[model samples]
Target: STGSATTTPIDSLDDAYITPVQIGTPAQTLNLDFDTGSSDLWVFSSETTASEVDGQTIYTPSKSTTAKLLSGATWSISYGDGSSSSGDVYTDTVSVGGLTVTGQAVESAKKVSSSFTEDSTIDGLLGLAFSTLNTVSPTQQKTFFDNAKASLDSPVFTADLGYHAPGTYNFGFIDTTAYTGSITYTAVSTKQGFWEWTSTGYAVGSGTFKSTSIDGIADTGTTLLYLPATVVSAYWAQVSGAKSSSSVGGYVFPCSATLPSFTFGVGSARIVIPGDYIDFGPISTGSSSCFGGIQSSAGIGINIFGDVALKAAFVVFNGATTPTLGFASK
Candidate 1:
């Protein structure tokens, strides 16, 4: 009645998560980065530039009998890092965790950024954001989640990102066994094409809760937690020897420093991220100085609660008429 996809994080850094998805009729499966931050379902395909192709699996439209070109349709998407991919579109059979959908827009990349070619682990991206954000020209394509919503038991999805372990993306009905305690739901603002929510407040370690509301997007596509400079500075200030280094990209601290837990309020409930999680990793191999999982969002125009925060709780994306987000302890 529903679907469950177990996505595995790349390496120990948890750079990105990958889920195998079947494309075309014969089921040529590719490992896709299921991103809730973007809305273009693109893949490395036979139509891609030869120089742009790495060791990644390429989808062949000609091989699939069910494939049909979405004439004149083209899509181009650029990320915050300036990495981009532009492609022509085709409609084909696509399946996720045994749930198949026909006439799914399958973007065949004709041009790509070096970041994509360098990472052979990711064959494509299966976007789960709102269809309004799709980059396709002439006709915007709906995401797999949106396409399947009407028939689904419920118009919702859940993300359970685990640290140093496997995670899951479940569509339709929520599995009660996956989370503990009551879910605290907050109204979602879909105007920006993201699962954006407002956090009631935060607290550093044993400190008092700061009742200031901060609005941010909950993105599986982003790897780190980015917040207002004031909040970020507060968290780092508590860690001895921690400093913000432009060269290191963000704040760095002693690897041996005892870290404190960070907590954020979701309505009336508090979700805590352990200190060890804040210590992202060393700036370099075996370096004594470690990078921070949470950083200031001053440079970027928006704040993000990425995997660093997502991994600490059970998140539900309720796609009802009036969208809402639910959070619970796991």
Candidate 2:
């Protein structure tokens, strides 16, 4: 069968997208960040130390009769951003967009990093990447998408992100109306447990194309677009006032400077990101210097096509045995 759900941005920067998820027998609804960058379906729960629980929603296993502890199991995960959480595990009924999975592994977070605790909007994370990355020891768990794959009309899901509006994640089948033009499919390497793919080339603004392969993951969880130092530099150079400021970290530029649109090649397709997207936001409240949405991935060790890039096009995480990705204009 097919299912659809709306994902709304947590903030104006589109720092992250949150989708509602129901967990446990009685179906406790919590807004979860659907992250394709990592694999671990974890949550803020009653088991979490009371003080650790901030303004976010919490799941109580005791309230769900179907909840069952996964004896001898524990999970801990660290992210690229250094934020992390660890907890025990439980199996319960989990549903998203009306698609149900019985006995879905629902990790109960006992401790979380300050970054997560400080974010009042996010209840937890629903990992959509491959199950190989699940942090559960003894036995790795399958992602919610993995458990729901067979029941879906198709073993695929698509991510349609919006600039400031609400986005959508469709499962089972592609919504023909969600995108324009034919999808340009490319091979995906799940070796990293990510929807990793290689882009053909890139062009800054309306400039000529540079034919060079750039590999990165289409990460819905990450906020910005990170590329090679050379590419990032080339784009920033065009803005006369742009500079790599050590004070603010990374690239910061005059808020008044006009940014050029960025274009990246996906297979034979070229997707262009609007210039306004690069503006990001001010470095601080009432500051004229602004941070860039595109930064150098050199420090992170890997390029990431985050929400800044994903918002420019329609992305399909085709989960077929062949494991491929599809990109199309919206």
- For every model shown, the clashing-pair count is 0, 0
In candidate 1, which residue ranges exceed 4 Å CA deviation? none
Q: What root-mean-square deviation over C-alphas does model 2 reach? A: 0.8
| C-alpha lDDT of residue 215 in model 1 | 95
- Local accuracy by lDDT, each model: 0.90, 0.93
TM-score of each: 0.97, 0.99
Model 1 TM-score (2 dp):
0.97
Worst 10 residues of 2 by lDDT: 45-54
Error of 2 at 84 (Å): 0.3
Alpha carbon lDDT at 32, candidate 2:
96
- Cα lDDT tens digits for candidate 1, 181-214: 9889999998989988999999999999999899
Please give, for residues 178-240, the per-residue lDDT of candidate 2 as tens digits.
889989999999999999999999999989999899999989999999999999999999998
Clashing pairs in model 1? none
Identify the candidate with maximal TM-score: 2
Question: Could you say which candidate leads in lDDT?
Answer: 2
| Alpha-carbon deviation at 116 in model 2, angstroms | 0.3
